[PDB]
Design a protein around this ligand. Structure first.
Ligand SMILES: [Zn+2]
Ligand SMILES: [Zn+2]
Ligand SMILES: [Zn+2]
Lengths: 286, 195, 320, 102, 111, 141
């Protein structure tokens, strides 16, 4: 039912080698979600690494901008649930077999035969990105995804091969922390990790820190851009720009709006292509 | 026009306006827009259509009946695909990444692996063009009463309603009629025997 | 004072000169050789028979259909003919041995009509369920199935110039297809009562359509409503058109009507009487075709009879 | 890209679907091939053919009996050969109903 | 699909006849809002055939002429097929072609 | 009418416009959409819907309903503008006598003489259609 020429293949599954050899089939395995006969391709990424043939088909990868074999996004290198939780639009897809699954899957394959270049619904909302998901976007990822799965007979001590067993050895797995939408167990801990980062400890008073020491101005930040980026938060009382240290001083009437600026600018407010420097003001008349 | 053209790649939904269902102006001998083209154009488009359906039916015969001794392929080709999604430090030096593509041999001792038994309802078809009939008329209150039907007074129905009113019982003229019921030549027989 | 009134071309009228009545079962379709020898027809007698054109004698009959025969056609490049009917079978009748050699099958319902391409060895067939299908000669495999309708498809024509396939169906629409890709090119929505007859002319463009209500006229490139004709309000079945400009429409009430190509003028308005066995209202024209000289017209009606018309060499039939 | 069951999705090597008659006989020049169609008149030939076909048909023994002479066999003749397609009144049905039953 | 064999002869001709009269009365009735009460003209056709089999003259009043005379020509076409099959299988069981109990016990009532 | 019964108006317009561009020849879809717009404001998009509704050539029942729509908001110039294309389609005497309606609305004097010229030069050249001069003499009296 499905033929292909080349799969999606994000970089963490290609391997460390730009020179890999790959064999192909015409009708290979079924997808583990919808059982569609795609074309499984097989290659060797590394010398200590398993083959990682193919998990899903091309069509289900073209719905949500997903790679081919490890089920992560191509645009970041993240799972699907983090992506549509950060963008707050799920682009729903059924769960059963013959109820509504293959119906809308065949129709979305039928309407996407022209382009084959972009996903069906994420083309308009993958543009307003790089704000909340750029904070965890791992460059040069760990190659432990590519290492082979654990073998038996070393857990029981029966392995006659010894060192020439190609899979792994001396790796005790843990039965406490290991599909398409939900639910994923370590991903909940990853959302707890991004919800429990390392900010500055909030001093115990009643919102008196309305000043803020922001610097790194140079020639990109100007006064009108900064006061219009503060104007969407609210109104000023006394603002200034100092150029001997390349810094700006802003305050607010009732602190809370600038408080989310404190949520916005903990090495996080990225305007004009620069990681700005932010530390605390005095708020003490010192 | 895009309201009725939805999803299509610039098809012929330009019918959607009123101005192309009026009768076109009278043509008598206007050769370039009315006459057929030359033999060369119809022959070249016939050759294109013939080689298209010929390669289609050749793929069909080498797909429906492929059993008799076909070679697989000669997979000596490479493919070069630029990693233009992530690479700034991902696999440092990955700039266009040419790889090797061969084909696995399918042995001819295999049944069909995947159960081709799925049945789904037919999905949404091509989107409906505008309908653009003549202005719809309604006749009277009496001709609509003329174009109706009485209920069925059948003997065997095995259907909705056997439908007994007080009337509609004989369901005929009189169930038997001869238009004169007799001939007088009977008399020209009968008394002629009697005398 | 009327528009396009002074300029119709004067066609001489058609008149009866022989009738052909030998069937036992409703005769349905008429095809004729390009070699002007005989003409083939089928019936609900389940016996396809051919008739000599000049002498009128029965050349031969042949049976083998399980149901009625709803279409018959003969090829020009090849010495054999094709037939089809409601027995879910399309038979390829050889003419060198008078036997079936291919026996096309694969249609999920009954078969209404069929047509051949004039240049290449493909065939198009319109059926009853929802589809028209392409049969490849020398392969007898379905290359393309044309699935875009919601009802039965009455007639089908195909030619060498683009666009190829014209299918008029019982869901009150026509559509013109793409023979290569299989998807449709254009859909045509008019005719509150369904379309049952389309025909190629064959000299220049502007093909015509056929329906019971306000019979129309179309165009090959991009689609174009050229003209609608007068009040031919009977329910119709057949259209046949001549190269010199005369056209004939065959209906279900026995009334067959002539037209012209220059204007759209109804000329004769002739009605055919019944041969003795038929009752008062049984006559319905289900087939009509000209000769290859186009000097003789012949129709197959619902009275199990083929009526043959010739010209009239008079002069006093002028247009008002 | 995902055709029907006839193309690839089935190994049903079915009966009646075989490469039989895998060559097409072409109409050669002695028959009514289209090269001889593109130039022949078709009109004078049919006229001379129908004109050639129209001329193809060019006492003291029973003095005591009651009925001495009926004088008529059918009262005109026995040659009608007419056609009534009403199947209850056709003469083939009359022979069917006078021959097989008695 | 499946072909028509010798058993689905009478169970296919009736289906094609009711489909033909269906798309004929769907394309002959005028612009009123109701077509046929979804089965009634089929019931009149079937009752006209049953009345022809008993030779009841079938004079129903208050009925339009085109639907009743198209029912008359359709039951006449079914009568032509019926008698032309009756003559054929009577000749076949006369000369000894088939020995079928169904064909003979059907041809008894079909004569 | 289900989507109209709910408070969602955007999806309602998104189904009304494809309904009326799918089936132009029916009248009830255009009628109920314009009635929903009667419940809504009198914005110029309603006038775009009404000029599309003029564009498909309906019968008299639509066109004099639209001129009654133009009367029920007191439009003098635009109702005069849309009414010139009215007479060229239907030459009905009921419309010939009601092309002379600005006489009984605005009294239109010099252009009333021009409209009466239009009433006297067109069809009815030798037979008068036995009704136009009655209303002409009625207004002249
Ligand atoms: Zn899948
Ligand atoms: Zn991957
Ligand atoms: Zn081991």
């Amino acid at each position: 039912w499905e033929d292909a020429d080349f799969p999606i293949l994000c970089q963490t599954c290609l391997g460390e080698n730009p020179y890999i050899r790959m064999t192909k089939e015409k009708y290979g395995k079924e997808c583990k979600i919808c059982a569609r006969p795609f074309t499984v391709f097989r290659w060797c990424p590394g010398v200590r690494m398993r083959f990682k043939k193919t998990e899903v088909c091309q069509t289900c990868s073209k719905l949500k901008n997903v790679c081919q074999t490890c089920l992560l996004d191509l645009e970041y290198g993240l799972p699907i649930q983090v992506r549509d939780a950060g963008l707050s639009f799920k682009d729903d897809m059924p769960k059963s077999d013959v109820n509504k699954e293959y119906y809308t899957q065949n129709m979305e394959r039928e309407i996407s035969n022209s382009d084959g270049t972009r996903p069906v619904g994420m083309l308009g909302k993958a543009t307003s990105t790089s704000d909340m998901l750029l904070k965890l976007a791992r460059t040069t990822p760990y190659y432990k995804r590519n290492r082979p799965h654990i073998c038996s007979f070393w857990v029981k001590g029966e392995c006659k091969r010894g060192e020439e067993c190609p899979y792994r050895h001396e790796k005790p797995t843990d039965p406490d922390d290991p599909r398409y939408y939900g639910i994923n167990d370590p991903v909940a801990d990853k959302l707890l990790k991004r919800a429990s980062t390392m900010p500055r400890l909030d001093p115990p008073e009643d919102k008196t820190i309305t000043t803020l020491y922001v610097g790194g101005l140079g020639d990109t930040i100007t006064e009108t851009d900064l006061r219009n980026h503060f104007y969407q938060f609210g109104e000023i009382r006394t603002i200034t720009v100092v150029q001997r240290q390349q810094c700006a001083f802003i305050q607010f009437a009732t602190r809370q709006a600038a408080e989310v600026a404190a949520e916005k600018s903990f090495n996080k407010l990225i305007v004009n292509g620069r990681r700005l420097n932010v530390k605390w003001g005095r708020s003490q008349a010192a | 026009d895009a309201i009725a053209r939805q999803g299509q790649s610039k098809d012929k939904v330009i019918y959607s306006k009123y101005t192309d269902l009026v009768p076109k102006e009278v043509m008598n001998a206007d050769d370039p827009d009315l006459q057929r083209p030359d033999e060369e154009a119809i022959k070249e488009i016939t050759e294109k259509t013939r080689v298209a359906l010929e390669k289609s039916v050749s793929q069909k015969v080498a797909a429906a009946m492929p059993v008799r001794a076909a070679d697989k392929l000669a997979p000596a080709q490479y493919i070069r695909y630029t990693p233009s999604q992530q690479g700034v430090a991902f696999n440092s030096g990955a700039k266009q990444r040419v790889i090797r593509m061969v084909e696995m041999q399918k042995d001819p001792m295999e049944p069909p692996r995947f159960k081709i038994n799925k049945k789904i309802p037919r999905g949404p078809p091509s989107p409906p063009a505008p309908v653009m009939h003549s202005p719809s008329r309604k006749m009277t209150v009496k001709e609509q009463q003329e174009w109706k039907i009485p209920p069925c007074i059948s003997n065997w129905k095995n259907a909705k309603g056997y439908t007994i009113p007080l009337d509609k019982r004989l369901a005929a003229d009189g169930r038997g009629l001869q238009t004169v019921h007799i001939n007088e030549n009977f008399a020209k027989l009968a008394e002629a025997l009697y005398i | 004072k009327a528009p396009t009134m002074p300029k119709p071309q004067w066609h001489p009228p058609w008149k009866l000169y022989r009738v052909i009545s030998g069937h036992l079962g409703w005769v349905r379709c008429i095809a004729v050789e390009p070699g002007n020898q005989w003409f083939v027809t089928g019936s609900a007698d389940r016996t396809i028979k051919i008739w000599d054109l000049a002498s009128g004698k029965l050349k031969l009959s042949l049976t083998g259909h399980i149901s009625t025969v709803r279409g018959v056609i003969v090829s020009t490049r090849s010495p054999y003919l094709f037939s089809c009917g409601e027995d879910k079978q399309v038979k390829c009748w050889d003419l060198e041995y008078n036997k079936v050699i291919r026996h096309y099958h694969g249609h999920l319902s009954a078969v209404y009509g069929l047509d051949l391409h004039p240049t290449i060895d493909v065939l198009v067939t319109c059926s009853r369920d929802s589809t028209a299908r392409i049969w490849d000669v020398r392969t007898k495999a379905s290359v393309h199935t044309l699935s875009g309708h919601t009802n039965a498809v009455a007639t089908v024509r195909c030619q060498a110039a683009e666009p190829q396939i014209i299918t008029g169906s019982h869901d009150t629409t026509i559509r013109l297809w793409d023979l290569v890709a299989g998807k449709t090119r254009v859909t045509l929505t008019n005719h509150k009562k369904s379309v049952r007859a389309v025909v190629l002319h064959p000299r220049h463009y502007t093909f015509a359509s056929g329906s019971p209500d306000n019979i129309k006229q179309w165009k090959f490139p991009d689609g174009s409503f050229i003209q609608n004709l007068s009040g031919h309000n009977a329910i119709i079945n057949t259209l046949t058109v001549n190269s010199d400009g005369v056209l004939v429409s065959g209906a279900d009430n026995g009334t067959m009507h002539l037209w012209d190509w220059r204007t759209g003028y109804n000329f004769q308005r002739v009605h055919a009487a019944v041969q003795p066995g038929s009752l008062d209202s049984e006559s319905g024209i289900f087939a009509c075709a000209f000769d290859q000289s186009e000097s003789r017209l012949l129709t197959a009606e619902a009275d199990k009879t083929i009526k043959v018309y010739r010209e009239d060499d008079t002069a006093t039939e002028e247009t008002h | 890209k995902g055709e029907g069951d006839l193309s690839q999705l089935s190994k049903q090597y079915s009966s009646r679907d075989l490469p039989s008659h895998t060559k097409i006989k072409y109409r050669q020049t002695t028959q009514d091939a289209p090269e001889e169609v593109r130039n022949r008149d078709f009109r004078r030939e049919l006229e001379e053919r129908e004109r050639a076909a129209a001329r193809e048909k060019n006492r003291r023994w029973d003095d005591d009996v009651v009925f001495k002479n009926c004088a008529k066999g059918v009262d005109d003749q026995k040659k009608d050969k007419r056609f009534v397609n009403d199947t209850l009144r056709s003469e083939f049905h009359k022979k069917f109903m006078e021959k097989y039953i008695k | 699909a499946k072909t028509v064999t010798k058993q689905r002869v009478e169970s296919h001709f009736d289906l094609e006849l009711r489909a033909a009269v269906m798309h004929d009365i769907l394309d002959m009735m005028p612009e009123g809002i109701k077509q046929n009460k979804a089965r009634t003209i089929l019931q009149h056709l079937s009752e006209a055939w049953r009345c022809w089999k008993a030779n009841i003259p079938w004079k129903v009043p208050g009925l339009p002429t085109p639907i009743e005379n198209m029912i008359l020509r359709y039951v006449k076409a079914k009568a032509d097929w019926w008698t032309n099959t009756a003559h054929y299988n009577r000749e076949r069981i006369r000369r000894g072609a088939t020995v079928d109990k169904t064909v003979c016990k059907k041809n008894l009532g079909r004569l | 009418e289900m989507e109209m019964k709910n408070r969602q108006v955007n999806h309602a317009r998104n189904i009304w416009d494809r309904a009326i561009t799918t089936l132009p020849r029916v009248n009830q879809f255009w009628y109920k959409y314009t009635y929903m717009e009667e419940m809504l404001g009198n914005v110029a998009g309603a006038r775009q819907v009404f000029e599309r509704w003029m564009e498909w050539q309906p019968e008299e029942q639509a066109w004099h309903s639209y001129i009654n729509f133009e009367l029920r908001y007191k439009e003098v110039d635009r109702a005069r503008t849309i009414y010139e294309r009215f007479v060229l389609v239907h030459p009905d005497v009921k419309n010939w006598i009601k092309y002379a309606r600005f006489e009984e609305k605005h009294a239109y004097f010099a252009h009333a003489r021009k409209v009466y010229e239009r009433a006297v030069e067109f069809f009815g050249d030798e037979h008068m259609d036995e009704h136009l001069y009655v209303a002409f003499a009625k207004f002249e009296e």
